[PDB]
Amino acid sequence: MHVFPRYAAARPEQAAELVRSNPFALVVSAVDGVPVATHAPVILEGDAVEGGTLLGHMARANPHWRSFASSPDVLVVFSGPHGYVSPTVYATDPAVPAWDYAAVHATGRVELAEDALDVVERTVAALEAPRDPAWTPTPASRERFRALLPGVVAFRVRVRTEQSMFALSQDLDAERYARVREAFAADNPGLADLMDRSLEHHHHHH
Amino acid sequence: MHVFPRYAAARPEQAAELVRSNPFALVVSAVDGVPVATHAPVILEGDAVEGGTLLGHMARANPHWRSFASSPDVLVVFSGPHGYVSPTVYATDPAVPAWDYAAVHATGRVELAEDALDVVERTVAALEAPRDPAWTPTPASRERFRALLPGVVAFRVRVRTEQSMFALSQDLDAERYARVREAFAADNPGLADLMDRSLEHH
Numbered sequence: 001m002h003v004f005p006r007y008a009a010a011r012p013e014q015a016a017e018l019v020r021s022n023p024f025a026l027v028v029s030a031v032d033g034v035p036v037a038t039h040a041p042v043i044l045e046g047d048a049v050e051g052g053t054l055l056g057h058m059a060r061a062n063p064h065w066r067s068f069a070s071s072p073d074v075l076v077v078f079s080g081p082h083g084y085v086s087p088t089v090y091a092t093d094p095a096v097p098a099w100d101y102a103a104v105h106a107t108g109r110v111e112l113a114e115d116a117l118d119v120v121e122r123t124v125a126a127l128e129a130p131r132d133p134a135w136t137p138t139p140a141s142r143e144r145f146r147a148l149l150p151g152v153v154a155f156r157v158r159v160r161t162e163q164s165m166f167a168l169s170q171d172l173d174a175e176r177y178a179r180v181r182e183a184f185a186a187d188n189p190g191l192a193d194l195m196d197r198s199l200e201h202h203h204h205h206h
Numbered sequence: 207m208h209v210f211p212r213y214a215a216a217r218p219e220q221a222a223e224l225v226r227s228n229p230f231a232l233v234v235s236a237v238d239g240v241p242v243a244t245h246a247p248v249i250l251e252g253d254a255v256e257g258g259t260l261l262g263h264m265a266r267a268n269p270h271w272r273s274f275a276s277s278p279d280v281l282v283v284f285s286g287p288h289g290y291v292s293p294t295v296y297a298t299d300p301a302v303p304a305w306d307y308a309a310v311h312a313t314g315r316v317e318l319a320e321d322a323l324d325v326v327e328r329t330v331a332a333l334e335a336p337r338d339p340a341w342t343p344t345p346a347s348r349e350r351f352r353a354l355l356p357g358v359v360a361f362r363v364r365v366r367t368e369q370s371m372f373a374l375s376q377d378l379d380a381e382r383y384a385r386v387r388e389a390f391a392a393d394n395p396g397l398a399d400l401m402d403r404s405l406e407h408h
C-alpha cells in the first residue's frame with residue numbers, strides 16, 4: 001500500500017481506532033509468489049497497531065494456516081467505510097471520479113497461538129462490546145466452545161509495520177467537500193461519520 | 207480462501223454478479239515473500255470470472271505495480287456486503303457468533319497495460335452505469351484525463367482460478383434464518399438484499 005501524503009493519518013490513534021472498529025479482516029500470506037487470503041475476525045492487543053499484536057482464528061479445515069508454521073510475514077488488511085465519489089456530486093467541470101475509503105495494513109510475523117480458547121473468547125468479548133446488550137456466553141455456550149475447539153486454528157501476528165490510508169476527500173475545496181459529505185450522509189452514514197471524525201485534526205502542511 | 211461446500215456459489219453467474227457489483231477491490235502480489243496490497247477499482251471483461259480478464263489502475267507513485275513487470279500471479283479480492291451475526295439475534299442457547307459475508311477471490315497472471323487511457327475510461331463507464339443520472343466525461347474532463355496519464359499505471363489480470371464464498375446463513379433452520387434476515391433488514395439492507403438474491407440461485 002502506498003500512503004499518499006494528503007491521505008495520511010494525523011495520529012496513530014486513528015489507525016488503532018479503525019482496526020478495533022472493523023475486526024473482520026483479510027489475512028494474507030504468500031507461498032511461492034501466490035497470495036492466499038482468508039477472511040477472519042482479528043483483534044488488536046495493545047494501544048498502537050505498529051509494535052502491537054493481532055489475534056485471530058480460522059478453520060483448521062482451511063489449509064491456509066499450514067503456511068504459518070514457518071512463521072513467515074503476513075499482511076492483515078483492516079477496511080473501514082468506503083464509497084464511490086461520482087463527479088455528478090462535484091457539479092464542476094473538468095472533474096475526475098474518486099473512491100473514498102479508509103484502511104489499515106498491518107505487516108508482521110505470524111505464529112500459531114497456543115491458547116485458541118482465549119483467542120476466540122477474547123474475540124467474542126471485543127465484537128460484543130460495542131453492542132447493547134452485549135451477549136455474554138453462558139456455561140452451555142462455553143461448553144460448546146470447548147467442544148468446537150479442535151476445529152479451530154488460532155494465530156498471533158506481531159506487527160512490524162503499519163500503513164494507514166484515510167482517502168476522505170480532504171484535498172477537495174471546502175465547497176466540493178461539503179457536497180461529497182452531504183451526499184454520503186444519505187445511505188452511507190458510516191462514511192460521513194468517518195469523514196467528520198477524520199477532519200478534526202488533519203495533517204495538512206505537515 | 208477455503209470455500210466450505212455449504213457456502214459455495216450456486217451458479218457461476220453469482221460470482222460474476224458480485225465482482226461487477228463491487229468493483230473497489232484489493233489487488234495483492236508477493237514482493238520478497240511479503241504480501242503487498244492496493245485498493246483499486248477493477249472491472250471484469252467477459253461473462254465469467256474464471257477465464258475472464260480483470261482491468262484496473264493504480265498510481266505510478268505506488269511502487270506496487272513494479273512487481274507486475276515480471277507478470278507474476280496476482281490475487282484480486284472482491285468483497286460484497288457483510289455483517290456480524292450476534293447470538294443475541296439467534297435467541298438460542300447454546301450459541302456461537304458468526305460473520306456473514308460474500309467474496310470472490312480471482313488469481314491469475316498480471317500484465318502491465320499500454321492502453322491506460324482505455325482502462326480508466328472503461329472504468330468510468332462501468333462505475334457510472336448504475337447511477338441515474340450517469341456522468342459522461344466532457345471534452346475538458348477527457349483532456350484532464352490525458353494530462354493525468356503520466357501519473358497512472360494500468361494493468362490486466364487473466365484469471366486462472368476463482369474461489370467464491372457466499373456465507374449467508376443459508377445453513378440455518380427456517381426460524382433462525384428469519385431472525386438473521388430480519389436483523390439485517392435494519393441498518394445492513396445491502397446484506398439483506400444479498401441474502402434474498404442468494405436464495406434459490408443467482
Ligand code: HEM
Nearest residue numbers: 040041058059062120123124145148149151152303304305
Ligand atoms: C466472536 C465472533 C466470531 C466470529 C466473527 C467468527 C468467525 C469465523 C470465521 C469467518 C471462520 C472461517 C475462517 C476460515 O474461512 O477459515 C471461523 C471458523 C471457525 N471458528 Fe469462529 N468466529 C467467532 C467466534 C468463535 C468461537 C467462540 C468459537 C469457539 C471455539 C469459534 C470456532 C470456530 C470454528 C470451529 C471454526 C471452523 C468452522 C468450520 O470448520 O466450519 N469461533 N470463525
Ligand code: HEM
Nearest residue numbers: 097098099247264265267268326329330351354355357358
Ligand atoms: C472511474 C473511477 C475511478 C476511480 C474509482 C479511481 C480510483 C483511484 C484510486 C483508488 C487510486 C489510488 C491507487 C493507489 O493506491 O495506487 C487512483 C489513482 C490514480 N488514478 Fe484513478 N480512479 C478513477 C478514474 C480515473 C481516471 C479517469 C483517471 C484519468 C487518467 C485516473 C487517474 C489516476 C491517477 C493519475 C492516479 C494517481 C494519483 C496520485 O498519484 O496522486 N483515475 N485512482
Ligand SMILES: N[C@@H](CCCNO)C(=O)O
Nearest residue numbers: 096097098099171354357
Ligand atoms: N491526481 C488525480 C487523482 C484522481 C484519479 N483517481 O481517482 C487528482 O488530481 O485528483
